[PDB]
Symmetry: C6
Subunit: 86 residues, 6 copies
C-alpha cells in the first residue's frame, strides 16, 4: 500500500505544472489526472511516504504560482478498497 498524493486545481495548467513539479521533486509514479467538471482537475501520484510528501509539497507550490490551487493532500497508507475509485 504505497502512499497517495493529490493536488486539485481550478484549471488544467496548474495541474500539468503540479505533475511536472511532483515527478521533478521525488521518485513518484504519476497515476493520472481526473477532470470532475466545474473546471476542477486533480493529479495523483503514488510512492513511498517520504517521496509523496516531498512531491506534493513541490506540486502545490508550483501549481499556486501558475494557476488556482484548490486542495493538496497525502494519504500515507491508503486502504486497498480506495484503489477501486482511483
Amino acid at each position: 500500500s504505497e502512499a497517495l498524493g493529490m493536488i486539485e486545481t481550478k484549471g488544467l495548467v496548474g495541474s500539468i505544472e503540479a505533475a511536472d513539479a511532483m515527478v521533478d521533486a521525488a521518485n513518484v509514479t504519476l497515476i493520472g489526472k481526473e477532470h470532475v467538471g466545474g473546471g476542477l482537475v486533480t493529479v495523483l501520484v503514488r510512492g513511498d511516504v517520504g517521496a509523496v510528501k516531498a512531491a506534493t509539497d513541490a506540486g502545490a507550490a508550483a501549481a499556486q504560482r501558475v494557476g488556482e490551487l484548490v486542495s493538496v493532500h497525502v494519504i500515507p497508507r491508503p486502504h486497498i478498497e480506495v484503489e477501486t475509485i482511483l
Copy 2:
C-alpha cells in the same frame, strides 16, 4: 421494493480530493464496501458505501469529518434500507 423482507452511505464533495479522503476514511472506520464514485458535473463528486446500518453510520461520520478537513463537503447521508429501484441511479 426492499432487498430483504444493505444500508447505503454517501458523501458528496466539491472536488475529487475531498471524496478520495472521504472514501479512505469510510473504509478505514468500519466494515463497509466502497461501491464507487459518481461525477455529476459542476465539480460535484459522490462516493458511496454499503454495509450494515451501524457500520455505514460510523463510516459516513468518519468520512464527513475527513472530507471537511481537506476539501469542500456538500452532503452526507445514510439510507438504512434502500429500495432496489434506487440501484438503477447509483
Copy 3:
C-alpha cells in the same frame, strides 16, 4: 401516465429523493439525468395520485440532505414530450 420530477443541486439529494419517492407510492423510477453545473433530475412515472404523493415525499426528503431546485408533476404529458424524456 403522469410524470413526476425532482431536480437537485448534487447527486445525494437526488438519490434520497428517488428512495423517498418509491417508498411513498407505487411509481416507476425512470432514471436520472445530469445537465451540468451540478444539477441532477430524477423522474418517475405512474398514476397521477401516486406521482403526486411520491414527488411531495421526494421533495421534502431531498431538501433535508441537499439542495432542492425544482419539483413538478405533469398529470397527462403530451405524447411529443416523451421524445425528450429518458425511458426505462
Copy 4:
C-alpha cells in the same frame, strides 16, 4: 422556412415543463432539447409564426413557475444555414 421558438432554462425540469406547455398551446413540432453545460438546457420548436409565438409565450410562463427561466426567443423566418446547428 418555418419559425423557430426557443426557451432556455437553468435546470431540466423547467425545460420539460416548457416543452409540454408549448405543444399544449399550439401545433408546433418539438425539435429537441440541448444541454450546454453549467445547468443550462434549451428546448426548441418549429411551426408557423403564429403557433410558435403562442407556444413560446406559454412555455416561458410555464417554465418560470417551476424553475429558472433564462431566455425566450422566436425567430420568425430563420435562415436555412441555421438548420446546420439545430
Copy 5:
C-alpha cells in the same frame, strides 16, 4: 501556415439561445458560411463563420448586437487570416 500566400468570425455566449440568434443574424447580414457551434462546458457556446474579411466583420457586428438582445454575450472576434493549424481546434 496561412491558407493563401478565409476570415473567421466567432461569437461566444452563455447559453445556446444567444448563439442561435447570433448565427441567424450573422448569415442574414452578409455572405458568410456557418461552420458550426462548439460547447465547452459551463454554459459557454461559440458559433463560427467563414468568408471574406469585410463580410465576416459585418456578420460578427450584427451577430454580437443580436446575441446581446436575447442572451448573454461573452466574446466577439474576427481573425482576418487564420493559420491552417487553428482548424485542428475548430
Copy 6:
C-alpha cells in the same frame, strides 16, 4: 521539446491564443482541452525560445478578446508528464 500552455475561460480566447501562438513562432499546436466550467487550454510544443515567444504573444492576444486564466512554459517537461498531455 518545451511545452507552452494558455488557459482561458471561453473558447474564443483560446482560438485567438492558438492563432497568435502559431503566428509568432514555429511551434506545433498540439490541440485543446476542455475541463468543464468554461475552461479551455491550448497547448503548443517546440524549442524553448519559440515556445516562450509564442506563449507571450498568445497570452496578450487572448486577454484582448476573452478571459485569460493561466499562461505557462515548461522548458524541459519530464517524460512522465507526456502521459497526461494530449498528443498530435
